[PDB]
Amino acid sequence: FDIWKNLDRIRSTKKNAGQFIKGSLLILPMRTEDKQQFDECMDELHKYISKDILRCYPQKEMLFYIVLKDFNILDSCFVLSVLLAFQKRLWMAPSEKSYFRVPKNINLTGSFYLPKNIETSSIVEVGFNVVPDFQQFQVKACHVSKFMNELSNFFSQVEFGKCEANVINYFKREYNRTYSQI
RNA sequence: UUUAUCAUUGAACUAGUUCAUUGAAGUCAUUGAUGCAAACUCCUUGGUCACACACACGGCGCGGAAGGCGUG
């Protein structure tokens, strides 16, 4: 249940997981109470993602938008597994404090957004999605190694592209609006 | 393959870039638009005429359609 050996294992058996999908965009928002705790985890995460594929947009009125685009499948396998575990760790094992090491007996849950145009189990698409032009996907409770396999099998099917440049700015507009209403 | 508005103010920033606010207009589309090519399926039309299955040096069956030329 360590992310590096599991990420190499998915590197081996994924049948060409290296190349990046055209016009590929993934948006996961998350809220964290501790800014000092999350800023160092994300800072340690930007090391291998080279800041172009992954960008962090804060929203201040704590809410961060995690935008991951032009990504290879093996990259999203890494990042989403890091973040979704970091989100549970605060409640589960605050004494752990090892970012890439997932502590045992923690099941990964959460949700992420993709553009409404995508062309196609643990990861399921939801009916009745809020954000108008986007579609959110649930990741049911799963072990990390199971999550790598399910996600790696998910991004092999989806074939999508042709998105406007600033669309992320549209996502911010819609997502802030929906919660402003509630 | 290539594309997704302009202007003003503030913050950060190299010496152009990101975020927020104010104003103007704003064909829809990006599953679009441009180029390239194929396969398939379906519609309309015809004398689906007669004699003939006949080893030649490139005709001279009956009609219909469309012309050119000529005489009265």
Joined together, the tokens standing for residue A48 give: 């291998």
Elucidation technique? cryo-EM
The three-state secondary structure class of A48 is helix
Q: Are A158 and A118 in contact (CB under 8 A)?
A: yes
- DSSP state letters, A56-90: EEEE---EEEEEEES-BHHHHHHHHHHHHHHHHHH
- DSSP state letters, A141-180: EE-HHHHHHHHHHHHHH-B-----TTHHHHHHHHHHHHHH
Please report, rounded to whole angstroms, the spatial distance between the CA atom of protein residue A104 and the C1' atom of nucleotide B53: 91
Please report, rounded to whole angstroms, the spatial distance between the CA atom of protein residue A1 and the C1' atom of nucleotide B49: 87
Give dist(CA A39, CA A92) in Å, integer: 19
- DSSP state letters, A107-150: -EEEEEEEES--B---EEEPSS-SSTTEEEEEEEEE-HHHHHHH
Q: Are A151 and A142 in contact (CB under 8 A)?
A: no
Q: How many CA atoms lie within 13 A of A179 on its CB side?
A: 10
Nucleotide nearest to A169 (CA to C1'): B19
Residue A46 CA, chain-centre distance (Å), reads 14
Which chain B positions have some atom within 7 A of a protein CB?
Answer: 2-5, 19-20, 30-32
The three-state secondary structure class of A36 is helix
Joined together, the tokens standing for residue A20 give: 């990046």
Q: How many CB atoms lie within 10 A of CB A123?
A: 17
